[PDB]
Enzyme design. Structure first.
Site, PDB file in Angstrom:
ATOM      1  N   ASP A 154     -23.370 104.890  78.634  1.00 24.04           N
ATOM      2  CA  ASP A 154     -22.660 103.823  77.937  1.00 24.04           C
ATOM      3  C   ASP A 154     -23.553 103.258  76.827  1.00 24.04           C
ATOM      4  O   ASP A 154     -24.771 103.417  76.864  1.00 24.04           O
ATOM      5  CB  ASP A 154     -22.245 102.728  78.928  1.00 24.04           C
ATOM      6  CG  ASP A 154     -21.039 101.919  78.455  1.00 24.04           C
ATOM      7  OD1 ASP A 154     -20.643 102.038  77.274  1.00 24.04           O
ATOM      8  OD2 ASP A 154     -20.479 101.157  79.276  1.00 24.04           O
ATOM      9  N   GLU A 189     -20.259 105.359  84.315  1.00 21.45           N
ATOM     10  CA  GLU A 189     -20.949 105.023  83.072  1.00 21.45           C
ATOM     11  C   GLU A 189     -22.237 104.271  83.373  1.00 21.45           C
ATOM     12  O   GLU A 189     -22.204 103.160  83.905  1.00 21.45           O
ATOM     13  CB  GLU A 189     -20.070 104.160  82.168  1.00 21.45           C
ATOM     14  CG  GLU A 189     -18.802 104.837  81.689  1.00 21.45           C
ATOM     15  CD  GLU A 189     -18.022 103.993  80.701  1.00 21.45           C
ATOM     16  OE1 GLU A 189     -16.846 104.323  80.464  1.00 21.45           O
ATOM     17  OE2 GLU A 189     -18.570 103.006  80.161  1.00 21.45           O
ATOM     18  N   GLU A 235     -16.690 104.434  71.223  1.00 22.49           N
ATOM     19  CA  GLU A 235     -16.225 103.124  71.656  1.00 22.49           C
ATOM     20  C   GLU A 235     -16.451 102.099  70.548  1.00 22.49           C
ATOM     21  O   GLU A 235     -17.519 102.048  69.943  1.00 22.49           O
ATOM     22  CB  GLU A 235     -16.873 102.704  72.984  1.00 22.49           C
ATOM     23  CG  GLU A 235     -18.386 102.773  73.030  1.00 22.49           C
ATOM     24  CD  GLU A 235     -18.952 102.325  74.362  1.00 22.49           C
ATOM     25  OE1 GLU A 235     -18.338 102.636  75.405  1.00 22.49           O
ATOM     26  OE2 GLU A 235     -20.017 101.668  74.363  1.00 22.49           O
ATOM     27  N   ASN A 288     -18.193 101.338  84.998  1.00 26.55           N
ATOM     28  CA  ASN A 288     -19.532 100.938  84.567  1.00 26.55           C
ATOM     29  C   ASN A 288     -20.406 100.690  85.796  1.00 26.55           C
ATOM     30  O   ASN A 288     -20.086  99.847  86.635  1.00 26.55           O
ATOM     31  CB  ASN A 288     -19.485  99.684  83.685  1.00 26.55           C
ATOM     32  CG  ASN A 288     -18.597  99.855  82.461  1.00 26.55           C
ATOM     33  OD1 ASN A 288     -17.377  99.667  82.535  1.00 26.55           O
ATOM     34  ND2 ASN A 288     -19.202 100.194  81.326  1.00 26.55           N
TER      35      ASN A 288
END
Ligand SMILES: [Mg+2]
Ligand SMILES: [Mg+2]
Lengths: 223, 224
Positions: free
Chosen positions: A123, A93, A180, A61
Site C-alpha cells: 500500500d 495490503e 490509488e 489493510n
C-alpha cells in the site's frame, strides 16, 4: 461507526478500460484488528453466497504490528476457511513502512501467506521506508501507487516520469499494478496510456457500504 | 584521535577521478563531527588545489540531518569556502534520503540557499531510507547516488538491475547526476556502463585513501 457491530466501507478497485469491478479495499495481541479482517470476510462470503463477487478479490489493510505476531497466519488461514473463501480471493495490503527487523521473519510470513493462498500488496508505494529495497527481498504480488503521485498526474509533467518508472518496476518484478488516488480524467487517461489499468479513486468510485457494493457487484461494472 | 579518509569517484569509462568523498577512518555528536569534517575536508581539498592537483573535481561531504536545518548552516558553509578559496560548484553536500519527513520541508530553502553559494547537493543511499520519490520533482538536488545494496550483487542478483535501471531513468528526467557506490565487481561495473551510469565508487575502482595518497592519485589523474 458502531451499530453494536462494525460498519465497514469498501473502496472498489476497477478495470478502468471496461469499468469492471476487480476488487474491493475494505476501509473503516492488543491490536486485534482481525476483527476488521473477520468482518470483511464475512461480508465478502455473503456477496459470494448471493452469486456475486465470485471472481473478485477482497483487499484488507494489514498493519506490520498486526503482521509477524505469532499465529497471524493461523488466523488469516482459519478466518478464510471459516467463511469458505477460496485461494487468491483475499489480498492483505501491507504498508511500505515495514521498518522492521527480522526481514527473514517478514519473508517467511509472506511466503507463509502464499502457501495459504493469500495475496500480498504494498500500500502507499513510494512513500514508506526502504521503498526500492523491499522489492528485492519481499515476495509480494501487487503494487499500489500512492495518492501523492496520481493526484497531479496529468497536470504536472513531472509526475509521469516517476509513474512510468514505477510501472516499469512492477512489470520487471512480475507485480500486479493498482493506481490509488485517481481523482481526475487526466490522471485516468495517463495511467491507461502507460499500462496501468487497475485503479481506485473518487472519480471511479467512492467507499460504499457492504449492501451497496453487493448491488454494484451485481452490475459488475461502473461508468 | 581521528583522521580523514577519501573514497575517490571515477569515470569507469576512462578511469579518471571526477570527485572524492570525504569519510572518516575508524551541538550533537555527529553535529560536531560533520562540522569538523566539512572544515578539515575543505582545508585538505584546497591544499590539493594549491599544489595544482584536483583543480577541477568535486569534494563530496556527508552532511548529517542535525548539522543541516540549523540556523546559520548555509551561511557557515559559504564561510568555510570563502576561507579556503574553494570555487563555486567545487563542493557537493551528500544528504541521506531519510531527511524528507525527519526534517521539515524548509529543506527546500536550505538547498536554494546552498545553490546560491555554489554548493551542490547529492542524495545518498537512495531507495533505502524514507523515500523522497514524492518530492524529487520539487527538490532541486543535483546528484543522485545508487546505494551499495543495488550495486553490490549487481548482475548476479536479479532484483538489482531493474532497480538500478529505474533510478537511472529518474535522474535523467530531473537532470540529476548519476553516481554509483559500492561497485565491488566488474560484473556490476559492466552493467552500469551498459545501462547508462559512468560515475562510480567502489573497492574494485579504488580503495579509500588518505589525503596525501589522494594528492598522488590526483596528480596522475586516473586509476587503472
Ligand atoms: Mg489502500
Ligand atoms: Mg555517502
Amino acid at each position: 461507526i458502531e451499530g453494536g457491530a462494525l460498519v465497514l466501507h469498501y473502496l472498489p478497485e476497477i478495470d478502468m478500460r471496461t469499468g469492471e469491478v476487480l476488487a474491493a479495499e475494505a476501509l473503516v495481541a492488543g491490536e486485534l484488528g482481525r476483527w476488521v479482517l473477520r468482518t470483511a470476510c464475512a461480508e465478502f462470503s455473503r456477496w459470494r453466497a448471493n452469486g456475486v463477487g465470485r471472481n473478485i478479490v477482497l483487499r484488507i489493510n494489514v498493519s506490520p504490528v498486526q503482521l509477524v505476531t505469532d499465529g497471524f497466519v493461523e488466523s488469516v488461514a482459519g478466518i478464510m476457511k471459516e467463511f469458505g473463501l477460496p485461494r487468491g480471493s483475499v489480498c492483505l495490503e501491507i504498508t511500505e513502512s515495514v521498518v522492521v527487523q527480522d526481514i527473514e521473519t517478514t519473508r517467511t510470513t509472506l511466503t507463509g501467506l502464499h502457501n495459504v493462498g493469500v495475496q500480498v500488496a504494498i500500500d502507499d508505494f513510494g512513500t514508506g521506508y526502504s521503498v526500492l529495497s523491499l522489492l528485492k527481498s519481499l515476495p509480494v504480488d501487487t503494487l499500489k501507487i500512492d495518492r501523492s503521485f496520481v493526484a497531479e498526474l496529468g497536470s504536472n509533467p513531472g509526475d509521469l516520469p516517476i509513474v512510468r518508472a514505477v510501472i516499469a518496476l512492477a512489470g520487471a518484478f512480475g507485480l500486479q499494478l493498482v493506481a490509488e488516488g485517481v481523482e481526475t480524467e487526466r490522471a485516468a487517461l495517463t495511467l491507461l496510456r502507460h499500462g496501468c489499468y487497475r485503479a481506485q479513486g473518487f472519480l471511479l468510485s467512492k467507499p460504499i457500504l457492504g449492501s451497496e457494493m453487493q448491488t454494484l457487484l451485481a452490475k459488475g461494472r461502473v461508468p
